[PDB]
A paper describes a structure:
The β-barrel assembly machinery ([name]) complex is a conserved, multiprotein machine that mediates the folding and membrane insertion of newly synthesized β-barrel outer membrane (OM) proteins. Cryogenic electron microscopy (cryo-EM) structures of the [name] complexes from the gut commensal [name] and the oral pathogen Porphyromonas gingivalis are similar and reveal a 7-protein, ~325-kDa complex with most of its mass on the extracellular side. Remarkably, besides BamA and BamD subunits, Bacteroidetal [name] contains a 14-stranded integral OMP that is intimately associated with BamA. The remaining four components, named BamH–K, are all SLPs and form an extracellular dome-like structure over BamA that may provide additional functionality to enable the folding and assembly of the many β-barrel–SLP complexes that are a hallmark of the Bacteroidota.
Class 1 lacks density for the periplasmic components but has good density for all extracellular proteins, whereas class 2 has modest resolution for BamA POTRA domains 4 and 5 and for part of BamD, but with poorly resolved extracellular areas. The crescent-shaped BamH subunit is positioned over the BamA barrel and forms an arch-like structure approximately 60 Å above the OM surface. Based on its structure and the conservation of the protein core, BamH probably functions as a scaffold. Of the remaining three components, BamI consists of two domains. The small N-terminal domain is conserved and interacts with the BamJ PPI, whereas the less-conserved C-terminal domain contacts BamH and adopts a six-bladed β-propeller fold, with each blade consisting of three to four β-strands. The conservation analysis of both BamJ and BamK indicates that their putative active sites are directed towards the interior of the [name] dome. BamH–K all have glycosylation sites, with by far the most present on BamI.
Author numbering:
A (entry chain J): 27 to 214
B (entry chain H): 34 to 95, 98 to 436, 446 to 492
C (entry chain I): 28 to 196
D (entry chain G): 18 to 537
The structure:
């Protein structure tokens, strides 16, 4: 197969229809102030085919400390494979693996670059699981499309197609789902 | 038509190779680092290699000039230490055109005595001069003399030669009574302490006495303040002890301010600090009697001091001889060890810093191996090991085919010790040993 | 510029060789016999001895280590390599445009035959300027930066020599 | 096939072609030592130790750190039996040992709230992991650790931290000591066979006494239970109410400075083994026995989601004295001394107007290290030159090297030089700034007034920096820079030129510029 692998849209449509999920266009997302309603399970159709839901826009009392260029951002997440419905990557605590202290003790941290074009990001510290499993330092480009829409300590959920995935998703043409429990500005 | 060289020899110990210097101007070969004493059984049939030169034809005088067996083994035991009774392995090397002619002479340098071994000799070098050897002992060095004090106002002495620890010195066989005698009333001899050029002493009534030469003693006007009272003098810090970048000069001790014990430091020619808000309290685990101390320079250029001694008569969960250190005179800190690497409980322990390591000796009380049994050593002050080999206690002889009658090993007696400025260990035994022992590790006397 | 390099370099060596044999005061030159080729000579010039000798009498051996300030130049005076670039080694140098020179460690058996012959006859703190033929330099094709068949001239200061690096560095 | 014609032809080319010349000219730069100020450190390494130097005096360091707690982390639920009407046990849930009075459970201490047992504590232990260190590695040293917070004390926050001289005595109280440990930075208590392993990372292991362990572990466990019972989740802010953090202090020892990479705390507890189907306790498989148990733990560590700070104390009088030397300038790295240079931008702007600048070279050069000390301070390997307008803003905004306002260079040990080799962009930037100021002012311009104000228009500073690279794109090697930060390990170098160059021309640097002169 060469072009047949780009049928990932069928798998994403399967993953959508398997659950209660509604699609909102960005031109509606930016006009009902800015929120994806959680009682209705809204998702925005972002650029490059990313579907994204903000669960908590973050920093609700300060409202000012948004992300920007040259920041270093800490990420905690759990990654689900779309094609076979399996938890593939994580660095967060859950009771089913509570005693595996190596997996969740340290977060992933990346530098955020936002010059006039071509936003990109590089892991400074990879988590143990990512560092052993995927062994690459390039951040999934789908994550970086969400930063301009959220603040510090935000909680977001993303569906990322292959064109903007990581170094494995781009080769084996596999979309993924990320439950980003937290974006944080890096301290110390 | 050259005579270039790379002369080499194979492993004597497993993985151990010895380097040879090549003096082409003077035409001779030798190894700078001498072969160990063990090697005279190994070089009995040994192999030469890497004897590379412009043309390999080489011969040794035998009457004939027979060719070298470069690929075959050779007995070198005839050619060791060839500088006197000179018997070099002398060999001739030819140029590729056979016109230019040269000879080189080879010397296999080998030790006559084991380097890292503590040499006590066959016998103790002198008897203990003290009358009634059951009395308390103390030994200290001052200038060019070694002094031995006894509690009954009794003093003995011996003198040291001109200098240079590497020279062929002999001393200690004769001891003299310092006939003026009369160290002060009520003194406690085991408290005697050195400073830059003076000796200090403590009495039972807690007066401090001092001397310039050990012959005569007086009270001093600077340490005997009112209000305070001294109870122990620990050690003294000075420029003479090391290389202190901290610039510390004075005496460290313990003073009982208003009935409670505090560490205090008497800086050069001024009285003890007595300000109770900025002294520190002596812990209950700290040694009380028969203290020993040493001062040395850390590799950073900063002085450090270490002490051991007898504790109070009874205290909880105590099973080991912990050593207390201090970077200055204000506060001592214990080198407590959580693991099993902690040395046993010892009675009247003594500590020294010596040949880039630390050593402790004392007598044990486990009732199945009582007495002095071995030295204990540490490379880094926080882990302690027993030495089961060289560096033994005095009187422990190797097989000449044994235990010497006046040896410390297995005895339980009073004693004292010191290290002089030629790095001789001096050990003095009381009732039950009655002798003076002297020793040094051979590696400290070598010119290398 | 670099025309007929070999002949002119050899002619330079011959000029020094016969100046030592005919000029008054030897023209300032002095010479040593070469042990790798008896009958050949290396020519050198004595210079200002140092004033901070580490008091190490004797001369270095073939298989032991050496600490030096050195500079290497070709017949035209152009730079090849060294610790210093002016006309003297720099220590506590007043001029803020030049740094104090580092010291370098060599093994007498690990250098060109000219160095290997002359270093075995210095005493610590001698300064010599030495003139070596292309037979005993790198020679033939030469190294990087050497045009082949080149007679190098070196300026050497011997600071220290020892059996191992760890007692010298 | 020839392609040269040599040089024949010049002389009949037009004047604007054959008049162009190259030229080299030099201008004078003065340099002086300046104090560091309040730098923004913000590093993840914690420095602990002390050492003495004969030139700079005593250097002492210690650090404060908060411990993290992952979202939703909890300790296993207490083991609870279920019985039918006969008293016979039928099923059970939970895993943690909860029953006292049993001589088999004298190995742990049970902890409570109200009158109910919520769990047990076996031990609490701190590991301070470190990859490397500075100085000698057989000098014995001692370290002691305190719990942060208390009655009336301050707490770490985004404004208090990242200054290298916070006074810890108002963050902690001396009576809250947790423990102490003696260490040597190479622990000869551990066998060589273990220390050679590739998986071995050194640490100081400073586990607490039973009373302290009970107090700390009970506080943490009761906070976790109090969060769980309210259907909250035990995020780090709730953990910080039970254990604020640690202060790590150096009591004794001279020579070692440890680079603590991650402080880590384990809380250890006792658990039953339970049947996979029916949940009951397993009986021991050996002879005799009463039940089967094992020990398990939860981990709390400083992981860049929480605050960590350092105290890096230089000897102030010695530093102030060395700043006042005028024959030389220093570069003492851990918040010590920088050197400031004044560029001759006005002279370049006057003398080389109409030229194309092809290179502007500035060189700093140094004396050798003194004393031949075995474990002495090293020369800073990488330094940054930055316009003084951006001295502190550069590190506070986490910028990378700009090219037009800051440069990086390595030490050239073969010549004892820092050389920057082309700073043309910075010169053009300064010239453009002044020309724009003159253009905006117009006829009311005054050159002397504008040079008397804005005195740091043409000033640059030289700073020791630590530069780190990415590792990817490895086979087609590129090695991009991803973080520049202040160098905080001990190190120094003495540079030539100095404050006396303000008056005496022997002590003044030269800046070398080469350009194309069109002869117009």
């Amino acid at each position: 197969y060469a072009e047949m692998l780009e049928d990932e849209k069928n798998a994403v449509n399967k993953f959508i229809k398997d659950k209660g999920i509604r699609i909102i266009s960005q031109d509606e997302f930016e006009k009902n102030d800015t929120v994806t309603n959680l009682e209705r399970n809204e998702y925005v159709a972002l650029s490059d085919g990313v579907y994204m839901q903000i669960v908590d826009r973050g920093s609700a009392e300060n409202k000012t400390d948004t992300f920007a260029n040259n920041n270093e951002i800490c990420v905690r997440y759990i990654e689900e494979d779309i094609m076979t419905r399996d938890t593939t990557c994580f660095n967060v605590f859950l009771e089913e693996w509570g005693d595996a202290n190596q997996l969740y003790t340290n977060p992933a941290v990346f530098r955020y670059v936002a010059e006039g074009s071509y936003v990109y990001g590089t892991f400074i510290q990879m988590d143990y699981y990512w560092a052993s499993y995927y062994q690459s330092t390039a951040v999934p480009a789908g994550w970086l499309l969400a930063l301009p829409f959220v603040r510090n300590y935000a909680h977001v959920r993303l569906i990322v197609p292959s064109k903007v995935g990581h170094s494995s998703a781009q080769q084996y043409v596999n979309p993924y789902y990320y439950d980003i429990w937290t974006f944080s500005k890096a301290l110390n | 038509d050259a005579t270039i060289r790379a002369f080499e020899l194979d492993t004597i110990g497993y993985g151990v190779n010895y380097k040879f210097t090549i003096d082409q101007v003077s035409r001779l070969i030798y190894n700078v680092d001498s072969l160990p004493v063990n090697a005279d059984t190994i070089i009995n049939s040994i192999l030469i290699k890497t004897l590379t030169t412009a043309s390999g034809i080489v011969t040794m005088k035998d009457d004939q000039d027979s060719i070298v067996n470069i690929n075959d083994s050779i007995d070198l035991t005839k050619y060791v230490n060839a500088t006197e009774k000179n018997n070099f392995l002398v060999l001739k090397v030819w140029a590729p055109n056979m016109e230019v002619q040269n000879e080189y002479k080879v010397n296999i340098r080998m030790h006559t005595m084991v380097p890292d071994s503590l040499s006590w000799g066959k016998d103790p070098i002198a008897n203990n001069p003290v009358r009634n050897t059951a009395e308390k002992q103390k030994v200290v060095t001052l200038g060019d003399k070694i002094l031995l004090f006894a509690q009954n106002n009794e003093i003995y002495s011996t003198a040291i030669p001109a200098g240079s620890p590497t020279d062929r010195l002999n001393y200690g066989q004769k001891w003299d009574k310092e006939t003026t005698g009369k160290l002060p009333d009520g003194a406690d001899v085991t408290s005697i302490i050195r400073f830059v050029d003076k000796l200090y002493l403590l009495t039972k009534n807690k007066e401090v006495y001092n001397s310039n030469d050990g012959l005569t003693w007086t009270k001093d006007e600077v340490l005997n303040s009112d209000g305070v009272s001294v109870t122990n003098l620990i050690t003294s810090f000075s420029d003479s002890d090391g290389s202190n970048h901290k610039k510390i000069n004075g005496i460290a001790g313990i003073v009982e301010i208003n009935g409670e014990k505090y560490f205090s430091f008497a800086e050069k020619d001024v009285t003890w600090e007595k300000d109770i808000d900025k002294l520190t309290v002596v812990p209950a685990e700290f040694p009380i009697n028969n203290l020993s101390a040493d001062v040395y320079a850390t590799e950073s250029g900063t002085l450090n001091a270490i002490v051991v001694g007898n504790t109070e008569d009874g205290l909880d969960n105590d099973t080991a001889t912990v050593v207390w250190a201090s970077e200055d005179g204000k506060a001592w800190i214990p080198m407590e060890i959580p693991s099993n690497n902690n040395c046993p409980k010892l009675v009247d322990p003594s500590i020294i810093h010596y040949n880039d390591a630390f050593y402790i000796c004392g007598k044990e009380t486990k009732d199945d191996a009582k007495g002095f049994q071995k030295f204990y050593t540490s490379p880094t002050l926080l882990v302690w090991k027993g030495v089961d080999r060289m560096f033994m206690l005095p009187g422990i002889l190797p097989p000449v085919k044994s235990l010497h009658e006046s040896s410390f090993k297995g005895k339980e007696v009073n004693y004292t010790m010191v290290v002089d400025r030629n790095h001789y260990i001096w050990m003095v035994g009381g009732q039950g040993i009655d002798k003076i022992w002297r020793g040094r590790v051979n590696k400290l006397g070598f010119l290398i | 510029k670099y025309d007929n390099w070999r002949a002119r370099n050899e002619a330079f060596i011959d000029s020094l060789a016969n100046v030592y044999a005919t000029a008054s005061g030897r023209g300032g030159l002095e010479r040593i016999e070469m042990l790798t080729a008896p009958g050949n000579y290396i020519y050198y010039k004595e210079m200002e001895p140092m004033t901070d000798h580490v008091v190490k009498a004797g001369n270095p051996k073939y298989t032991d280590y050496v600490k030096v300030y050195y500079k290497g130049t070709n017949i035209l005076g152009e730079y090849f390599d060294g610790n210093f670039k002016g006309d003297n080694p720099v220590v506590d140098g007043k001029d803020p445009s030049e740094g104090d020179s580092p010291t370098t460690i060599f093994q007498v058996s690990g250098v060109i035959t000219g160095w290997g012959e002359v270093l075995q006859r210095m005493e610590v703190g001698d300064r010599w300027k030495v003139y070596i033929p292309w037979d005993y330099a790198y020679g033939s094709s030469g190294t990087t930066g050497i045009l082949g068949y080149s007679a190098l001239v070196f300026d050497i200061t011997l600071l220290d020599f020892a059996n191992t690096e760890a007692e010298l560095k | 096939c020839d392609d040269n014609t040599g040089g024949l032809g010049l002389g009949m080319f037009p004047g604007n072609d054959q008049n162009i010349k190259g030229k080299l000219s030099t201008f004078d730069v003065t340099t002086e030592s300046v104090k560091t100020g309040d730098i923004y450190a913000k590093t993840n390494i914690g420095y602990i130790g002390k050492f003495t130097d004969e030139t700079f005096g005593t250097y002492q360091a210690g650090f404060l750190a908060q411990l993290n707690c992952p979202d939703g982390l909890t300790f296993p639920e207490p083991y609870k039996e279920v019985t039918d009407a006969s008293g016979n046990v039928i099923s059970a849930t939970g895993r943690m040992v909860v029953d006292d009075k049993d001589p088999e459970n004298k190995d742990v201490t049970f902890i409570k709230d109200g009158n109910q047992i919520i769990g047990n504590i076996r031990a609490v232990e701190l590991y301070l992991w470190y990859d490397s260190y500075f100085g000698d590695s057989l000098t014995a040293c001692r370290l002691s650790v305190y719990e942060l917070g208390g009655n009336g004390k301050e707490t770490l926050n985004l404004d208090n931290a990242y200054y290298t001289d916070i006074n810890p005595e108002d963050f902690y109280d001396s009576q809250n000591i947790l423990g102490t440990k003696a260490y040597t930075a190479v622990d000869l208590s551990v066998k060589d066979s273990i220390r050679n392993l590739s998986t071995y990372v050194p640490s100081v292991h400073i586990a607490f006494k039973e009373d302290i362990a009970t107090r700390v572990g009970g506080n943490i466990l009761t906070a976790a239970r109090k969060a769980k019972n309210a259907d909250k989740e035990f995020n780090s802010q709730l953990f910080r109410e039970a254990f604020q953090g640690i202060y790590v202090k150096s009591d004794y020892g001279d020579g070692t400075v440890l680079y603590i990479d991650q402080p880590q705390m384990n809380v250890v507890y006792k658990c039953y083994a339970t049947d996979s189907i029916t949940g009951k306790k397993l009986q021991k498989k050996d002879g005799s026995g009463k039940d089967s148990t094992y020990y398990s733990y939860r981990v709390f560590a400083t992981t860049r989601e929480v605050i960590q700070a350092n105290q890096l104390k230089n000897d102030p009088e010695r530093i102030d004295a060395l700043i006042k030397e005028d024959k030389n300038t220093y570069l003492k790295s851990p918040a010590g001394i920088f050197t400031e240079a004044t560029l001759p931008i006005s002279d370049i702007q006057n003398e080389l107007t109409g030229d194309t600048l092809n290179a502007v070279k500035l060189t700093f050069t140094n004396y050798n290290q003194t004393g031949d000390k075995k474990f002495g301070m090293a020369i800073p390997s990488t330094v940054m030159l930055v316009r003084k307008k951006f001295q502190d803003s550069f590190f506070k905004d986490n910028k990378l090297s700009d090219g037009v306002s800051s440069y990086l260079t390595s030490h050239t040990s073969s010549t004892n030089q820092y050389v920057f080799s082309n700073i043309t962009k910075l010169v053009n930037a300064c010239i453009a700034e002044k020309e724009e100021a003159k253009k905006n002012a117009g006829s009311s311009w005054d050159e002397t007034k504008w040079l008397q104000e804005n005195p740091d228009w043409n000033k640059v500073v030289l700073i020791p920096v630590l530069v780190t690279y990415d590792s990817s794109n490895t086979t087609t090697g590129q090695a991009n820079i991803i973080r520049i930060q202040h160098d905080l390990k001990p190190g120094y170098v003495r540079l030539k030129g100095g404050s006396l160059g303000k008056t005496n021309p022997d002590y003044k640097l030269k800046l070398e510029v080469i350009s194309t002169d069109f002869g117009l």
